RNA sequence: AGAUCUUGGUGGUAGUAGCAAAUAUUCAAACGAGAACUUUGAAGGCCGAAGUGGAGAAGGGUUCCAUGUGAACAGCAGUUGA
RNA sequence: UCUGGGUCGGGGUUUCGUACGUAGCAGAGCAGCUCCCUCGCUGCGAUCUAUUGAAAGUCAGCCCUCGACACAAGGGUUUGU
């Protein structure tokens, strides 16, 4: 369906931006039933919501 | 038969000649989609996401000159649709395009 | 036709046959092969076909 | 135990992107 | 079928092809095309350009 | 199109007994085949196909 | 019948001008009667810390937040929305 | 059709200018090994040389293929002295 709320809540719980929130494209229905920050906490631990790593900005070339 | 799969190489450079910079990559996927409707006859063409990554690998304007794809004419017998066959085109990485023929590939 | 430009006998000495698909500089295939000499495509052709 | 086919399908779920993207560490369903 | 002249590149120049350059000091050159002419006018040495006849017989 | 080289036979000209180059057009002309005959008649309104 | 008359309505123009300031979108999937525009994922880009970021004063006044509708409005659409 | 025309491939032409990799007692030199060696060996090093007139592109409105592959006697709307 629509996961505009779920991505915003996971952005706040994970303390990252909405850039770094990864919702499972396959378990969309599971996440769509998560209307509260507690459910988002459970889904983060369940692996359905993942914090993506920082995009690499290497300083090796400068070094 | 009608559930065959084949392996082509599409001269993208020929089909995107003259197109402007901000449209070469989008026109590439229209040309691959139009290619798959010709050699397979199916109005339903699905482009693999890895194939979409190959076309956009060098940005929006420096589309690769040649691409090695694989057209598979599979059955649409999963729902109700006006088409009974779709063609799923994937991406075949190659290290050379010399002497590459359109080859029938076993399933 | 009565002008001297008309009825003037045309005697061709040379006809250009260099490539018009660019700035061609050879007249015949044989002249190009002679000037350049063997290439890589000519070496590996007889490397396999003896 | 994991067999060859289980490892093959494991490769699908653990790759969630292209080259350079992180791997999927887990996927556990609980109620 | 006229005289065949030779370029900056040493290639054979046929009638109707290329240009002829007459410097004020009296020396006259001929060039096959604008690539050879520009190379000469930029004072680039023909013996350091790989596709030149002078390079291929030096090496 | 191409160009040729020919001697000139124009007395009193700067190019008499000289070689000149001239652009030429090549027009491929395979033989034509006759497959009919038309007759016309002259009328006070013009020629009409008889 | 007039008053560049007052008020209301209606034409031709005319399916016309136009919907061209600030680089840019694409693939797959889901929900759905319906997807260029919604959402998710992948990619390619932009703002480039004097930001298209994060917070306030004045002003607005409920626009805030959930759920639902798809009439009208958002000068295309919309399953989206101040 | 004595097939057809496509799509790839090949050849030709042509444009630029000699690819990656490997090799070199080539290289301004520098840093480490000196029972070592009697002039050497281990790394860094732009650049040079050979492989290599090589690499790459070339109809999309270039030329010739008869090599590969599939496809093509099909669709729709009309028309009568
Ligand atoms: Mg020309
Ligand atoms: Mg009145
Ligand atoms: Mg009156
Ligand atoms: Mg208009
Ligand atoms: Mg407009
Ligand atoms: Mg930028
Ligand atoms: Mg702000
Ligand atoms: Mg709101
Ligand atoms: Mg609207
Ligand atoms: Mg070719």
């Amino acid at each position: 369906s629509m996961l505009r709320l779920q991505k915003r809540l996971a952005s706040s719980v994970l303390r990252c931006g909405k850039k770094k929130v990864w919702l499972d494209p396959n378990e969309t229905n599971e996440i769509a039933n998560a209307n509260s920050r507690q459910q988002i906490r459970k889904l983060i631990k369940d692996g359905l919501i993942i914090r993506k790593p920082v995009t690499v900005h290497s300083r090796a070339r400068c070094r | 038969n009608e559930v065959v799969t084949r392996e082509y190489t599409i001269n993208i450079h020929k089909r995107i000649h003259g197109v402007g910079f901000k449209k070469r990559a989008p026109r590439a996927l229209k040309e691959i989609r139009k290619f798959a409707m010709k050699e397979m006859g199916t109005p339903d063409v699905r482009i693999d996401t890895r194939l979409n990554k190959a076309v956009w690998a060098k940005g929006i304007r420096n589309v690769p000159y040649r691409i090695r794809v694989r057209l598979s004419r599979k059955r649409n017998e999963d729902e109700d649709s006006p088409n009974k066959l779709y063609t799923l085109v994937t991406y075949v990485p190659v290290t050379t395009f010399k002497n590459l023929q359109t080859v029938n590939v076993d399933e | 036709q009565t002008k001297r430009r008309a009825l003037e006998k045309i005697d061709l000495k040379f006809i250009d046959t260099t490539s018009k698909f660019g700035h061609g500089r050879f007249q015949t295939m044989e002249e190009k092969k002679a000037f350049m000499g063997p290439l890589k495509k000519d070496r590996i052709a007889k490397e396999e076909g003896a | 135990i994991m067999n060859q086919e289980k490892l093959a399908k494991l490769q699908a779920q653990v790759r969630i992107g292209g080259k350079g993207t992180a791997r999927r560490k887990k996927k556990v369903v609980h109620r | 079928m006229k005289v065949e002249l030779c370029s900056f590149s040493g290639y054979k120049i046929y009638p109707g092809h290329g240009r002829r350059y007459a410097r004020t000091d009296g020396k006259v050159f001929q060039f096959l095309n604008a690539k050879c002419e520009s190379a000469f006018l930029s004072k680039r040495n023909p013996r350091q350009i790989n596709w030149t006849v002078l390079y291929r017989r030096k090496h | 199109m191409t160009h040729i080289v020919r001697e000139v036979d124009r007395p009193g000209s700067k190019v008499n007994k000289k070689e000149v180059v001239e652009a030429v057009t090549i027009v491929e002309t395979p033989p034509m085949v006759v497959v009919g005959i038309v007759g016309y008649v002259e009328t006070p309104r013009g020629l009409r196909t008889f």
Side-chain angles (χ1 to χ4, degrees):
Chain A
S1 303
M2 167 159 72
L3 301 188
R4 172 142 42 206
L5 169 67
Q6 280 81 18
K7 191 180 258 280
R8 163 182 90 80
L9 293 182
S11 167
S12 167
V13 172
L14 289 162
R15 292 177 185 268
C16 65
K18 300 183 308 277
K19 292 213 307 188
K20 299 292 171 241
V21 183
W22 184 88
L23 313 175
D24 204 344
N26 294 299
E27 315 283 303
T28 294
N29 303 340
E30 271 87 2
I31 309 161
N33 299 334
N35 60 9
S36 83
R37 295 162 161 277
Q38 271 296 101
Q39 310 203 38
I40 301 303
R41 265 166 206 122
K42 183 201 181 178
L43 284 180
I44 284 161
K45 146 179 155 55
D46 288 343
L48 296 203
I49 306 189
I50 289 158
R51 187 174 171 167
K52 293 189 285 186
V54 167
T55 301
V56 160
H57 183 190
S58 175
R59 271 191 41 105
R61 198 179 303 111
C62 179
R63 273 195 228 94
Chain B
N1 217 16
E2 68 187 351
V3 198
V4 74
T5 175
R6 264 188 292 280
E7 181 161 317
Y8 301 81
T9 175
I10 314 176
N11 189 0
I12 292 306
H13 186 201
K14 175 174 103 159
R15 297 174 167 80
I16 322 298
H17 184 276
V19 193
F21 278 168
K22 294 310 207 208
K23 295 167 171 188
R24 285 171 82 86
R27 172 62 59 101
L29 287 148
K30 291 192 192 225
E31 289 305 317
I32 296 163
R33 194 170 304 251
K34 184 195 153 305
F35 185 87
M37 294 177 70
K38 185 153 191 47
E39 273 93 3
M40 282 321 194
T42 72
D44 190 9
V45 174
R46 282 91 169 279
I47 288 168
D48 188 46
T49 47
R50 295 192 293 286
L51 175 65
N52 181 45
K53 287 204 259 204
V55 159
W56 292 80
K58 295 172 66 174
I60 197 173
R61 44 183 194 182
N62 296 269
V63 189
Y65 298 146
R66 263 155 190 94
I67 191 68
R68 188 80 164 155
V69 304
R70 172 180 303 206
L71 304 184
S72 298
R73 193 204 283 150
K74 306 152 87 61
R75 280 185 204 282
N76 207 354
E77 276 168 346
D78 317 321
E79 66 260 7
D80 198 0
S81 304
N83 314 106
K84 300 287 98 177
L85 298 160
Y86 73 97
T87 292
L88 170 66
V89 55
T90 60
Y91 162 71
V92 186
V94 286
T95 57
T96 185
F97 283 100
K98 310 307 191 230
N99 291 108
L100 272 193
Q101 328 276 317
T102 293
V103 285
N104 264 286
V105 56
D106 58 292
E107 303 93 4
Chain C
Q1 317 298 128
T2 51
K3 286 169 53 181
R4 308 189 87 159
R5 201 67 43 102
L7 57 87
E8 161 179 355
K9 315 295 299 315
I10 300 306
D11 184 72
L12 307 191
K13 292 229 161 181
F14 182 78
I15 305 183
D16 198 280
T17 55
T18 73
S19 161
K20 269 75 201 164
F21 199 49
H23 295 281
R25 55 184 71 103
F26 298 104
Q27 303 279 347
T28 42
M29 300 289 178
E30 299 80 28
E31 182 205 341
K32 179 169 190 220
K33 289 284 192 280
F35 174 84
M36 302 191 94
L39 298 149
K40 189 171 197 180
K41 62 193 92 180
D42 303 330
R43 162 182 81 122
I44 79 162
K46 304 173 222 164
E47 272 179 347
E48 309 318 297
Chain D
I1 210 66
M2 287 263 187
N3 51 28
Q4 203 63 38
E5 299 85 26
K6 220 153 189 296
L7 301 182
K9 66 95 176 180
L10 176 67
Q11 194 265 339
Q13 294 106 24
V14 71
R15 278 299 276 201
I16 58 183
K19 153 169 165 167
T21 81
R23 277 145 180 79
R24 181 155 208 199
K25 286 167 159 186
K26 69 201 297 297
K27 180 172 75 82
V28 175
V29 283
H30 185 76
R31 177 247 167 275
Chain E
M1 257 289 292
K2 313 179 204 185
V3 193
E4 312 307 317
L5 277 303
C6 297
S7 192
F8 170 84
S9 60
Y11 273 86
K12 184 162 290 196
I13 293 172
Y14 283 108
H17 288 268
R19 287 217 287 205
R20 201 173 284 173
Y21 188 41
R23 288 208 308 228
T24 316
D25 57 8
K27 293 178 183 177
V28 176
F29 314 96
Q30 55 266 0
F31 311 110
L32 199 153
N33 48 50
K35 157 152 102 160
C36 309
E37 169 195 337
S38 75
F40 185 87
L41 291 178
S42 52
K43 273 159 282 303
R44 284 196 253 127
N45 204 53
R47 272 90 63 195
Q48 298 150 28
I49 316 293
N50 285 9
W51 48 268
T52 307
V53 168
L54 284 152
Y55 178 89
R56 299 207 94 235
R57 65 178 64 183
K58 153 181 180 171
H59 286 50
Chain F
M1 280 189 88
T2 191
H3 65 279
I4 57 155
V5 166
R6 63 170 205 107
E7 282 268 326
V8 187
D9 203 69
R10 186 164 320 147
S13 194
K14 290 271 300 310
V15 287
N16 200 37
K17 269 86 169 177
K18 308 296 192 314
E19 312 275 357
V20 302
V21 309
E22 268 164 357
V24 288
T25 292
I26 318 293
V27 188
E28 183 158 5
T29 49
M32 294 178 81
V33 166
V34 174
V35 290
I37 296 141
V38 187
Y40 292 81
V41 60
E42 283 186 346
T43 82
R45 295 180 296 179
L47 292 165
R48 59 166 280 272
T49 49
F50 183 72

